[model samples]
Target: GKERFVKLLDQLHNSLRIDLSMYRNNFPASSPERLQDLKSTVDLLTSITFFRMKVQELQSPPRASQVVKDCVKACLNSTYEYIFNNCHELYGREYQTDPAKKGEVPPEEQGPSIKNLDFWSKLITLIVSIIEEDKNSYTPCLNQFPQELNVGKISAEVMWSLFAQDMKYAMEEHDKHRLCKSADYMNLHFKVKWLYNEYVAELPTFKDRVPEYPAWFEPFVIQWLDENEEVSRDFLHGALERDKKDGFQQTSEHALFSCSVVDVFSQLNQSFEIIKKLECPDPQIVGHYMRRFAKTISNVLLQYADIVSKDFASYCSKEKEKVPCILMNNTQQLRVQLEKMFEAMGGKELDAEASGTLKELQVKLNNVLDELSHVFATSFQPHIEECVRQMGDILSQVKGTGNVPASACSSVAQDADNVLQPIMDLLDSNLTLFAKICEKTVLKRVLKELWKLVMNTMERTIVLPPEFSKLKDHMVREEAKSLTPKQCAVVELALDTIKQYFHAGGVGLKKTFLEKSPDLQSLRYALSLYTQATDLLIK
Candidate 1:
């Protein structure tokens, strides 16, 4: 019976070597002829399996079994080769071009060219399905045969590796810069990549099997991705100069920010979302890509701030002039959107080091807005001083001759008419300008500063009655007047009106900030003394 098994094995080996060699055809994948040819070869590999069982049952000689196992591997290799060769030919296949009247055909009418997104999808899915067929059908039988024959692991990994080499060569020939813009660039990337997982090392069947990928195999668009960070960054810097040419075209009277803010985010989101989708297989590469993307956003935004802030520095209300007021909100709006970008870029999902840099950017951006406010405030000093001096002039008219508690001094409320009007007129026009033009947060900051300046001036001018006496005013001689009770009431009434304006009915500045100002608190204490009769006549 052992001799009979040996003879049968020898005949089987001879038949496989002859019939398997016939399966090795160079038939183009375009024809269905190759599938029929490959199926016939696979059917032989399955039939060859029973011979291994027979050899085991009969205890055939080792040399006899070696030839049978070797022949079965050759059959397995041939079937894999037939499939591998087609996957390569699929890689080399040309994008089907339209032979239709093709002169001046816009990209819209172009079919099967790299310009059309769908054809690339077809190419990707077609090759993916072929790999799927092999993984589903070819790998299982070959893997079991190797398990039964105990001739090491399946060698389709080696064949697929060679197929990977063929693909790299094919990709080298396509001129594909514009290809990255098409949707199928991402599709082709994922399909080729996951299919590699199908054959290389990711499947459950390959848990015990190891695979080797060529250095270039992982990046489907090797050349494009290698330079992508630089390419995207240059595009972003280029976008700034382009929009600078468009300049600050106003959006509308109501929308106060420069249109440039939206445009910057547009270009930046375009960069980030592309890198985000690349979805590299390795986390290290993905982390590097995202960190680089984050840095790009950082520089672009900083430079945008530099450009806007430089122009803003040249501005004064002596500068409006309208554009400068309108410009304040752009950077403020920029800060508002920045947290959104950080969250969009993976936020806490990012590595600890990268997220730290973005938070620092928030603080730096806040500092820029603060710096701008101070620059505006510098221009305000001269105007604010004029209002305070006018208030001092009216308060000096009190003539507080000896602490009379009578409210019937001819109702000399004339001081209220003269004193508050000029200051109210000054603030109403300026505050209205700021309210209408700036974004709300900007208005909040401006109001806080304005509120501080107002109280400081009143404290010096009315309460102390001595600060503008420090300035060169013609009415400096009234620097020593005392206030009667009616004049104190007039002063209190003026404070109430101004406080209400800053409060702006809960819509302007916050009352907590307003009511807590030291200047206002101090003024309240000093004015409370006006009715205190010189501290109870010095006791």
Candidate 2:
């Protein structure tokens, strides 16, 4: 009935060079008989027309011709309203069920749980990928319209209403969807990088320019991303949640294994720059970001350590086999990075406070490292014994048994031999880095205070780690229960030290952090480590 479809499609195909011809052209001939075949074909074409109308409505541009724009806008509105209300009723029904908890029945026996998350995932992916690819189409459609098309203004209001109640709500919602729907880690990472590159980093340059595009013509576009701070937080929150729930330990372990030590340290150095110059124009906002950052980091560290510790014996069973290949590689990689990060940030601390805040932070950091080492050492010892014992079991079983099935024996033997090396390698590398990352006395908050006043301080001050580390240790110990009088007193001292560091030099610290520390001459090793550590801590 339509061989011409191919020839006509070929015209655009060659022009676009996208190989539409590769697409299958076959249609079922016997479905519900010939009559139903024709009916199904007609229905399919009609459905496609509805979508094409929507696409066409989106693609039509606003011009000196104002009437054309209005017509197209109206068409798009009608199409979207129709699709959203009725067509998506199917999804709303499905969405009402909780996918995560639907597998209370035996996972193996369940035939597609109640939520059918895979269905929603496929639908959302199809929609979002389409929308993202057609962003120019959608943005221009609204921008080309009058202020009435400011639908995002409405979206902003709804989003803020949710966020204003509690910032945590946004994060929780984001976590739910991101972990459930996102495809993979690389894509997730790219989304974050792209968002930052496109929105936050690139925004300053656009201030002076008039845009040739319709999206630029809309003034609300200016405030949309920046003013919708809640939405940005939601997006970031979702991304981080996905990382934690799905890939935290895996990616972290992989990074410990494969990452370049120098580059990791380089990133840490950049983090110091950020920390040193960091200030919130609003104190309230500073507290929010700080608390959020602290909570997230604390969660990551605790969970990471737990994961390693819980699986300790199983992983360490082949440490000897693994040590030569994986353990050394990961350790050398992490140490080089940690040392560089510490060195870079430390110099700033010294220059900011001549007295001894630098020394104090270093000393406190060492204590944190020392305490963290206990976790590593305690966790690793049993692992080594397990590895040795497991090896002995496998050898003994092979020698002692003759009745066992060859298949079962071979499988057990292979697993017994192959399992331990990577786990041992990973744990060995990770624990060492954990200690390194954990040992900072001058956290981002402290460095920020110092940066503001570093240049103006007339006298050098010494901050002792023993004093601060005691405070830090006391603080952590107290968290195990209610704080005792001595613990609270120590915490107060730590807080006082931080406050004093801040009040000492404000703008002077800014000058030193941004310019001086980057080029500081003494203790380059420590300065480098500080720089690296700061980056790893914050970004």
Candidate 3:
């Protein structure tokens, strides 16, 4: 059995080394055609490596003679040296090209020739294939192998180191192409991207084996963030300057605030896209980085909210007019803008810092609006009161005169309408203004006060005035007998005044007021007598 096992290793070692030699000079040194040849060689070596390594470990109820163990070790050593030597030679030739060998070069010695870059990339693919092969075999064999079997020389750690080293090369190349304005930037960018992904894919397999392996991803993320920091600065500068150019201020400044904060979120999303495209070494690490970036964005937003809050507080303190015109007109738009930032952060909710800052801004806005609402109320309270007084005066005059037949009822009605017109216009405009600054509660309080003042005025003028009792007596008696034209006209005017009184308080108050008392019975009786008198006269 020992002799047969040694023979198997001898055959494998000789055959695989021969396979590697056949492809060693298959392509010219300057050509990009070496990859498929290299890949094929690496694939064959991988099979040989997997077989010797896994078969010995799997010999099962099984056993491995020291002879078979010695054969397996020889097989791994030959394959490992063959692949590593090819990788080293390819790395030096492609990346550290001779000064004379260089063709079109990037400015400031930025990138290797695209042809060389592709060659190096293929070499990396070869390395990854080898690493993956080891993982496939070695990992499965990890628990199965005996301590004395000694598969240590065939570990994937060397391949992982090669992978990390190439990844560094790709990063440098990407930066060179990007920063140096190489004409071949696009081609090199995509090529390096492919190489980087291949390298990243091979990393996770070695995570448990290589203690320093997981640390590799941190520098890459930090480098990307550093690059993006410049991008974010440029974007914010451009957007804020644009807002300033557009004359944003007071309420218009809200757009500036929104734009600045949204730009921060936009940068965060850009970073997220970069991480996703990287197909990073660890998904958990990516999530950790994303949340950190989100926090960075939220911090920026909080800073913005703080600045806005202070300025808003100062502005509210000094603006005697308390005009909240911009805030009122743009509140919903501002809300939509905030919501967009939340979505950019990746969903339906804001991070704690962002939410807290937003709450601070909201409270500040309400505070300013509350103060402004008082100014609004002060400006309009007198007008509201005056209008109620004038309507009351009109009703009192109609009740006192009791000469409806002599004066046209239409004329009296027009006078009553005139009393309400100025205040109606005032209420309309002021309430609209209040809506912008004050929440619904503020508007509700103002309207309620207005209704109470008008209703009280109406009650005093129409129900308790000296002429009210006389008018009621006329209506009750008129229902028992015929009425003169003058009496009918007077009664009609009185009834009309009652209707106008309730109408001014608005439809909302109608049923409640009517049910309580404007003497609906008295008005109905008066209206009936007037209708009959008019019908008889017309006939």
Candidate 4:
């Protein structure tokens, strides 16, 4: 039993000795003995305090309780005596012991006094206060010391050495646990925010004497920044993944809103927001990531443009319903959206590389429009030709019969109108595409063919029969060949039909053909000849 007690005492003694040496290396090399003595005394006091707790924890029956109480009393008496009697001897002096006398000392003379017992007492007290402060709680106690004591006059190198040592461990703590863990995003952001504030708060105290940032400051900033980068990178990657599934993936395939470039733009905006919120201490540090962020946005938008382009290509395919009206309308709308997206890209003020990406996107968009025009001409030219041929057939049959019945002219006009209605609808449906296609003389040729048909049909109907030859002689005989009422009516009917055909062919020709189309003037001249023929017969 006695041996066990001795062993436990020895263990406590060894623990106290270790505590004594805790600050041994922290002291100035000029006063190694003084530093050792200071540690030994504090360790002794701390050991006695722990010994009291150990004694209280011991098992105590009624008899042992009496002995425990007696032992505790003896331990307390000795502990108090040793502390009170030797404190001045250990500390070498007490605080405020000779304030007036110390006050007379010059400020320049104060630094040497810093190595004395009273100074150590205050210094150790200050360190204890700082070390005891809760990690989560902030206190400016380190900054509250008197400048006259020269405690704040430490060099940056010495200060950084101490700071670097502590931060190295701090970096590890956050790295292994907080930064690397897949903690909730808000939790991670706040932890990083707190660490930054903690770092900055402690910075002013250590860097107080140093005029500018220390050489080690960059490395220190980088360490914390690297942790931030890891956490932020993980967060952004997850967010982008979520957007890919819920946003672009849904839109680019089956959804029309997926065609909306703004949808992807909003994602880029959020990316910008994340970068803004997660900025580090150095602007240069954040700038590196900013450029990277711009690259991501450019790539995503380019991909979005490709999706839109592919859909357009599919719509314009030969096997699909080539409704030019619907196609042109959609094309116009898509182009407008592309323009808006392009403007949005410029508005972002992206760096050089991203701007270059946008320029490439612009070229691609123009190419798509060019392809669309080719498709429009190929599909639309045939309809114009078909209308011309149908009109030609009506005129050819009229010329073959050469019968000038008033009813026949009216019937032919109605038939032509019916045939041309569908063509009118087709043109009306896709005027924008028509405008593009009509820049060539394809429509002009079709119009000229209609002019020939109208002129031929009118000439065949107005030519008088050989029986009117006898009326060519005298003034009185001249009146004898006057047209019948039905004949006059038939001539009028042909003129009206020709006019109707011209109207159905589209009065609103594109500018390119409108300036050059002689169809209108030619049709007028043809109708005038038949009117003159009718008037001569009526006379």
Candidate 5:
């Protein structure tokens, strides 16, 4: 109860101190008039002091009747306000928003480049007179009160108006707290907590305070996070839409993917950092925050995976072959990051709904990865066909104008050794580039396709031999089918060389990619068919 008694007087002191701070800043405490103004303003504040008295003793509590209240109301309005109003006029003139009107105001006022005395005595006279008149003449009017005059409750008006006005100042402080730009919300947390805990909560306990004060923390957090997710999502969509304007950005060192997916991932991680920063106490409340962030993580990955899908639609272009590989790696990189992010966002520990939501997201990413790999492999079909045709061309180049062909002229070992050189050179360069560019997961997919391709080339050109549907400026289909025992032997060694090259001695493509290849096994089986005599093949 005594707290409000002191609380309003405390605020009156706060106002005078600022005005007094202005006074001293203006005068520097040097002149007699300046010193006297300081003394007089101090006297006005303390003149009606109640520090020693109990609140119940002086002011009865239902809200003291307005007889004295009206007087104090006029007292604050007419007397104190004149002093406050005139002093601020002097303050603004003395310290301009810009000292030179030509210069603009800086971001903050009290901080910027920035203070008078005999004029201060005029302030002192008004300041000294109010408390003096109250002490001498006006205060005695209070002593003449009847016993049931109900003077106490009206004292409530004095306190109420002062607080009404004081929070106006505190409201300004709240504005600063509200618009804080750092998004460093923890600093806001303690102070905002103190605002609720410090004054308003205590006010009602001290007296029958009104419930006009709205609650704070949750609304601010809800709205801030509202804008936060909105802001983050806008940036998220904004980043990928730009990809159509620009080609896929190569990843730097992260080994994950193109630039924006990593950035999108980084953005996702940052939101988790903010959610943890709240260390939010509301379990259901934080669950809302967590659930939504998990939702955003999935949205970000899926939309980007969608973007990658559209780009692969353009994979029909012969150029930007790297873009297709990078797109595959892009989704593959997302698949990697999604697991760690799921762990970071609380995999098993997360609320049940969000855990389920993220579990489903992993499946989406898995399917998206599969889509990327399939589309990439499908896009390479034309390239693999071209490689096989080059192998077919190698056969025609091996055939000769005369019956003893140039390929037959050479020893079988030397001819087979050189036969694979053209295709081998083509393969090494392309695979090296692919290996450098792709992640290991996508690289495995590409190598398997290459294995199918080389095996198909070996099988059609040699073992089956009935390969070319037709040819141009070149041999007949009949001629292509007529491989000598010598040339077919040449091809067998060449096919083995290709098989070893595909394995890369367990360094490039894994040995198992070849060892388990259905295509390679079929090619090898057919090679044995021709190698055996016709009677052995029939048996």
Candidate 6:
């Protein structure tokens, strides 16, 4: 069988002129195992061909095609069998396990030999390449052929078509391929950036785009958004509502233009950070960018403020509350935290450690108040009534005893207007503080607290109007808003002294009581400091 296989292979080789002698000479001189496997594969192929020959001879006419086709199948089968028997010991088990582990293995009843699989794949690829080459070059026999393929034109077209087809297939396969989208985004960005640079390069030249925007070209042709609002409105109303002459330009268009300016300025402000990071050493360039940046931010803020004032209903007042309160709430919370820290230090054990904590406390108090400033402006709703009640109680004592002589009621009221007047003067000095709170809080708390005392005070002294008594509560509340509670109580005590003298002088109240108490003096000093602070805050 081995000799028959070799003879049949020789016959096939004779048709192709294969150099078997050279192959045999180059065959491994060291491994008998390799040589034996090769010989055994030939033997199996010979047996397969003999079986097919019998089948072919049994047919009425000997089928030449059948003989060769069956022989090729038999050789292929025998080769597979020989490979399995010889190579399985080294690599077959690995192939069986690896394919299943790899997850993409095709299902088959019998496992394939792993040894030389890569070699087989490469060999098949080479064969396919040869077939492709032949298919491209082959034509009906003629010595003369078209110069197109020979001269490279047809080859070039074929290659280009192949590349184009591959690209089309790839694009169809992946939808996220951003060839067009990226181009569009970049194109838009380039156009906008170019317009911005060209317009702003010379500030004076920017005036040219206005006529084009309002009359000649598109409304947005104007670089400044505020300038285009009227045109946009006229165009829109003319197109939609036939009422082109209507006053929509004054209201809706005005608002749109206002918002457009705001939006553009907002973008310009954001772009400031980008220019700031340019690391430009040229002072002129830096100055230019800085000027533009500042102008954008300031203009936007001014415009936004204008819009809010003009159209108060555009934004919910409650929603607007939080933005201003950010600094306000932060300052309040920091104050609270520092107060707590001070409270903690007051314990017996922390007494020795109080100085360091007190220094930290002072630093916290001195925190650049700009952050919490808005709180002073924003109306605090809940604390109104409490402030009113505190302010009202003091107004009554001054009113009820205003008429009594100093001998009879020295401890109760002021003797002359001079005494009460100075105390009132001190209170007047704090007018700005009162005005701030009253303007914002609408004096709700002051009115509530002064409801009873205001009338009685009005009845006593006509030197000031009846309304002055009503305003007394507000005056105190304003001072209280800016001062510590301890400081407020001290101011109340001083006011009480003034009240006592105005009605009737009390010797103990005038010279003995407050003068003897060192604590009262310290309290007065703190009140002075607090008054100074309130003045500073007013500014």
Which candidate comes out best when scored by lDDT? 1
How far residue 100's Cα lies from its native spot in candidate 5, in Å, is 21
Q: For candidate 2, report its TM-score.
A: 0.23
Per-residue CA lDDT of model 2 for 482-515, tens digit only, reads: 2223322332343233334333355113444544
- Selected candidate, larger lDDT, 1 vs 3: 1
Q: Which lDDT tens digits does candidate 5 get at residues 126-189? A: 3443444444433333443335222223223333344335334543454445544334334444
User: What is the TM-score ranking, best to worst?
Assistant: 1, 5, 3, 4, 2, 6
Worst 10 residues of 6 by lDDT: 211-220
Count residue pairs with overlapping backbones in model 2: 51
lDDT of each: 0.60, 0.33, 0.46, 0.40, 0.58, 0.33
Candidate number achieving the greatest TM-score relative to the actual structure: 1
Q: Candidate 6, residues 318-362: lDDT per residue as tens digits?
A: 434332322222223333444443443233333333434444444
Candidate 4 residue lDDT tens string, 207-326: 343222222133333344344444444444434346434433323323223233344445556545544554344444444454455445444544543444455545444444333223
Off by over 4 Å in 5: 1-230, 241-246, 251-256, 282-285, 393-408, 417-422, 456-484, 525-531, 534-539
TM-score of each: 0.68, 0.23, 0.43, 0.36, 0.53, 0.20
Candidate 2 — worst ten consecutive residues by lDDT sum? Answer: 456-465
Who is ahead in TM-score, 2 or 5?
5
Which of 3 and 4 is the better model by lDDT? 3
State the lDDT of candidate 3 residue by residue for 468-499, as single tens digits: 23454363322334444444455456545544
C-alpha positional error of residue 109 in candidate 4 after TM-score superposition, expressed in Å: 46
Better of 3 and 5 by lDDT: 5
Name the TM-score of candidate 3.
0.43
Instruction: lDDT for model 3, please.
Output: 0.46
